[PDB]
Design a protein around this ligand. Structure first.
Ligand code: HEM
Ligand code: HEM
Ligand SMILES: [Cl-]
Ligand SMILES: [Cl-]
Ligand code: NA
Ligand code: NA
Lengths: 713, 713
């Protein structure tokens, strides 16, 4: 059946904004996963998981009698899709069980691992999500094998459909770089927001870059992709060596024996895939990656044998039974156990990417320290494993259950506890009046609170106004935030804060994070009053202020808005049309298409544009909250043409006289072009809509102010 | 950006079941369009529309000074996408304003018509939908030009995104027949459910079949496509000749002058398309279809001149200025007015498809009768226009406003008024007890009520249990309905009804339509009791019994389920996989994916399958309402293989013993295969879910029972 995407393959796609509707969710409207999980008997789940580790199923027999390596791999891949650039991927939504991840070549035979878990998922039902269970299973694997983990938080609610993520443009699984849809350009520069070297891989190719088995050049790919997953060199070595302390790879015969991935398999496969024609197709004969490597002498027990072997032997190149490049210690005795035959032993083997940890000079220093000090290795690995598997879980306030680690980590963008009474409604009213009396304008107030709150992204639940990090490095100097205007606003607000707090009794004080938000509320209230309407914008106190020392500046860089259509801002010139970047930003802000539409048309007339640009300011009463944007955008009396100077800026002229009325960008004019967006703009641009517009504006404004407020959840 | 549809183009698509979520709807959850419309001042709207008719705008000047022709065309195209095979298309959702219809070649320049109506839409806002306004504007055009309409009903709520409709498989707009994706095969047999001859046409090609200007062969296409749109010969001739009493076509220069359709046009085009480089690009120079025909001597006034000209002249083949085939009157004087120059006149002209009305023998007899009896023509066209524009609106209970015609029409599938007191709760308890005492089984009761209620389709809102049409021709004889079993159930229920009604006082009686549904409720209650649960199923009385003379048997045929996965029924072999047919039926029933899931798993264990098939009856307690379907479908102890005899039937065998446990179809096993469906099935198949399953089952059962209950809405 031919579809709209077939006829108009470049039209903007809005369906990303209406994923995750109540229609696709089996749970009731009022289901609260946190409440369910808080009553789980986590200890009982962990006992069942422990027993599972050594209870082999004949349809996928356990290597060495123990599923722990499989399950660590499973949990690492669940977490390993994460990209810092947009926060997408990661374990936090259990997306490994949906397309396309459930069928990525790097996730081969993890469909077996998930299926092994069904009896436990079934037993506990809605009290443990799949997302939580994949991570918990990896922790219990670790623990069962003698490794002390750093802790565990629950609270990853399940999702019910695929997320829309850009994973690349290649049309062939695993395509080597340099093709028509190459993710590389220049001197091996991977395109943002991608964090893997080939389509369908987690990070790197285990044989080496595009299959070339050079440990030195592989190290460059590891470093780059791990950095794009928020891990530095120490964390990267710890994670790779830690994980390869356990289990084995699977490459017993040629890869051509392996059949269709799950999404392509027949219905009788019942959601499994990669059925293999090689011998028994499983167990001793398993084929997963096509490598055949077993790292340590005790693959079911924590040890420091990975680095003993890596440093203790000299390595030579060889091929697995499927023909993949890997390495063997030919000088070694046969000390590595066989997974099924107690009468066989094997020499040590390593991947090309393992040898990277010894032959890249920076890695070698770290690997040597871990080798000589395996207690340092074990702490670094525990910490990095916790970070890997919680990186996309959001603020610590989301963490559930009895094993949450008490240590506060810099990467968590931590918010100090509030130890004092909060402002009440009367206090908030007094502060709103003081802000408006200071001389700060509607535009200043709205722009500042927007800048503070709109760094939130729901992909990894980082960002938002909590912390008052707008006042700190680097947010204070981001171009989108108008650093000299911002500095003057914050000085005024800080003076108001000092005066209020100095006048109080009995410990009551307001944070600057709360005041920035409250002051934006006052701006919105004043804008409505400018338009002849009395409204109260809701405000919830309880944000706290983080310090510069509690703020990782380099980690915060990926939150910088380089495109913010809601402020008509584009930091430079991108291949991606600006209207596409708008929808992407709306998706990160968790906005539907109606909410995006109302919010943008109101921000335009409140004076939120960077630089005070006139683009899209389709009103003669700027700083009044009206539906002017929509009424004037939709007026057929105005004709629109791209300017000679810039094809992405448009002039709106009176159709009869030629008189210049307005200018606008693609972000502005898409609302008059796109057939779904224009239908929305019509609702808000109708003569009966002034009350609706104001109410819907205030509701979406409040939603944005509260995106990071999981303390109130 | 590579998507799941790219990697797995044949995987089942569930997004169709989650269109139209509250996420995409700008109106609040509680907006009630019927209530808004009821308060509109329709008379004020109609005065505005009358004024618009001759208010010419320079960007699209009115032909002859009057937009009426353009607007009748616009309304005829809004309604003209309708197909009886599935009920999809039609005017009832205002889909003309969204892709792909807004950009179909046959809808060229209707983007201008819709834009002319923005100021009226804007003025009245939410109280008049676009869907209603398109139809209203066509009525006003008719009225304005001297034609008295049969009436008008409001009530078509707006929608906010494209419907998913199969419009064909061609990848080229307007592709002629016999291509790789041909919609024709055999002896010009058009594939169901399609009702147009080429992709992007409303019905037929105005030049003739595949462009061949043969009025006789064109007549064959007209008859077939119009019958696929629920119109017989009399209605077809009345509509074409009525419509072409007005206005003109547009073909002033070569079609190569006309630019991108709306969905492909530049952002500066602000939602319009087909910009033309020919002279002024508009008005006297307009190009729409490429034909240049004006039918009558008074194109802005109702007349009898269409049939005078059709019969009064002999016709010669000629070419328009764009090169299209059309016809000109031999020897005629220049009597037809020019649209813009009062000093020019033109000879009568006709389309190939107009000449069909004279040269097809059956049409000629009707056209002659209308020529000789123009009052008969006027009444037939009025009646047909009402039917055209209301065919997809559903029961008369949905019709709103002061111009609804009182006459009840056979095509409306009419339901007699209720003139008596309804049964109360005590009476319903008494009847349920009589039903369960009769010996009728759970399977009988559930199957009968399912058969009665599941004929509903939300595309055109036909069907459903109101009317008790299951007892009439043709529903009583449909194979899916198990005619012999059904007859024995109905006999028993009709005896219960007669006895109850005979014992009443004061006019109280129960209809058989209500009793059928109440008896199904009793079956579900009994099934719950069988499973050890205390459940009460909701029941709302007030259905009435329609007569055979109120039930057009030929129109009812299109409602026959030839595939009903809910009963594991497939009438024959289709190209389309059975699971795809299931999702299609769930969409017609207005179900989401969770609702489809719960409903099918419950129906299986209640004994709803046609023929008492054991396919998918994964329980050892048939006729008990449990979640056995899900728990047993998801048991990894069972292995599934297609049978040697039929690849679409599967055996489930104990994996260790080889013993046969179950059989299933594709409909059954898709719930264990498709990654989104299996996630749903896992919720219902978990140890904590028996209560949720029962409660969600009873809710979706009741939803299905009430689909046509617009008397309660
Ligand atoms: C440069 C990064 C990495 C590469 C290229 C890599 C590559 C692979 C490959 C090719 C296998 C074999 C899959 C199979 O054939 O069964 C695998 C196995 C495994 N990997 Fe990694 N890996 C990386 C990092 C990780 C990390 C960060 C962890 C966890 C902290 C991890 C843990 C595991 C485990 C436990 C297995 C064994 C699976 C089993 O016993 O069934 N790896 N790795
Ligand atoms: C065999 C079925 C039909 C065919 C092939 C047909 C074809 C066409 C075409 C080619 C045009 C010219 C479009 C343009 O260039 O602007 C048109 C115009 C029009 N048609 Fe039809 N038509 C059909 C049925 C109908 C019906 C059922 C109605 C209404 C009851 C209708 C009402 C009109 C009107 C009023 C116009 C004039 C538009 C104007 O003045 O701008 N037609 N038709
Ligand atoms: Cl994601
Ligand atoms: Cl439709
Ligand atoms: Na994420
Ligand atoms: Na329809």
């Amino acid at each position: 059946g031919t579809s709209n995407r077939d006829w108009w393959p470049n039209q903007l796609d809005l369906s990303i904004l209406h994923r995750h509707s109540s229609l696709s969710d089996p749970m009731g409207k009022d289901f609260n996963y946190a409440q369910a999980f808080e009553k789980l008997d986590l200890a009982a789940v962990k006992r069942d998981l422990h027993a599972l580790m050594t209870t082999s199923q004949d349809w996928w027999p356990a290597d060495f009698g123990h599923y722990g390596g499989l399950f660590i791999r499973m949990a690492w891949h669940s977490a390993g899709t994460y990209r810092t650039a947009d926060g997408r991927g990661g374990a936090g939504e259990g997306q490994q069980r949906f397309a396309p991840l459930n069928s990525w070549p790097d996730n081969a035979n993890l469909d077996k691992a998930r299926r092994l878990l069904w009896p436990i998922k079934q037993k506990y039902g809605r009290a443990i999500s799949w997302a939580d269970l994949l991570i918990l299973t990896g922790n219990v694997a670790l623990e069962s094998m003698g490794f002390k983990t750093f802790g565990f938080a629950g609270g990853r609610a399940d999702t019910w459909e695929p997320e829309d993520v850009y994973w690349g443009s290649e049309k062939i699984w695993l395509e080597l770089s340099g093709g028509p849809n190459s993710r590389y350009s220049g001197d091996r520069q991977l395109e943002n927001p991608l964090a893997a070297v080939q389509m369908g891989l987690i990070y790197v190719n285990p044989q080496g870059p595009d299959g070339n088995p050079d440990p030195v050049a592989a190290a460059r790919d590891i470093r780059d992709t791990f950095a794009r997953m928020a891990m530095n060199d120490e964390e990267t070595v710890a994670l790779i060596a830690g994980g390869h302390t356990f289990g084995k790879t699977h490459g017993a015969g040629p890869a051509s024996n392996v059949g269709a991935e799950p999404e392509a398999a027949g219905i009788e496969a019942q959601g499994l895939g990669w059925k293999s024609a090689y011998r028994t197709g499983k167990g001793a004969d398993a084929i997963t990656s096509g490598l055949e490597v077993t790292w340590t002498t005790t693959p079911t027990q924590w040890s420091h044998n990975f680095f003993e072997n890596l440093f203790g032997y000299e390595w030579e190149l060889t091929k697995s039974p499927a023909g993949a490049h890997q390495w063997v210690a030919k000088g070694a005795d046969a000390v590595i156990p066989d997974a099924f035959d107690p009468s066989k032993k094997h020499r040590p083997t390593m991947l090309t990417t393992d040898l990277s940890l010894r032959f890249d000079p920076a890695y070698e220093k770290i690997s040597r320290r871990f080798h000589e000090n395996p207690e340092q290795f074990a702490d670094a690995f525990a910490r990095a494993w916790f970070k890997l598997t919680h990186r996309d879980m959001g603020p610590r306030a989301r963490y559930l259950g009895p094993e949450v680690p008490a240590e506060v980590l810099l990467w968590q963008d931590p918010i100090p506890a509030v130890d004092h009474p909060l402002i009440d409604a009367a206090d908030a009213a007094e502060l709103k009046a003081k802000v408006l009396a200071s001389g700060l304008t509607v535009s200043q107030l709205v722009s500042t609170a927007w800048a503070a709150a709109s760094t939130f992204r729901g992909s990894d639940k980082r960002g938002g106004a909590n912390g008052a990090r707008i006042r700190l490095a680097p947010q204070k100097d981001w171009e989108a935030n108008q650093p000299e205007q911002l500095a003057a606003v914050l000085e005024t607000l800080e003076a108001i804060r000092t005066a209020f707090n100095g006048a109080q009794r009995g410990g009551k004080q307001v944070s600057l994070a709360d005041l920035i938000v409250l002051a934006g509320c006052a701006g919105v209230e004043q804008a409505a009053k400018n338009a002849g309407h009395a409204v109260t914008v809701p405000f919830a106190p309880g944000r706290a202020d983080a310090s510069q020392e509690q703020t990782d500046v380099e980690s915060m860089a990926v939150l910088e808005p380089v495109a913010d259509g809601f402020r008509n801002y584009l930091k430079g010139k991108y291949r991606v049309p600006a209207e596409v970047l708008l929808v992407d930003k709306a998706q990160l802000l968790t906005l539907s298409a109606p909410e995006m539409t109302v919010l943008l048309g109101g921000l335009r007339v409140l004076g939120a544009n960077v630089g005070q640009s006139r683009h899209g300011v389709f009103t003669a009463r700027e700083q009044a909250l009206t539906n002017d944007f929509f009424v004037n955008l939709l007026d057929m009396g105005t004709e629109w043409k791209p300017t000679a100077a810039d094809a992405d800026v448009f002039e709106g002229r009176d159709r009869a006289t030629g008189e210049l009325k307005w200018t606008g960008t693609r972000v502005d004019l898409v609302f008059g072009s796109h057939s779904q967006l224009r239908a929305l703009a019509e609702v808000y641009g109708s003569a009966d809509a002034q009350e609706k517009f104001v109410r819907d504006f205030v509701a979406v404004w409040n939603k944005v102010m509260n995106l990071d407020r999981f303390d109130l959840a």
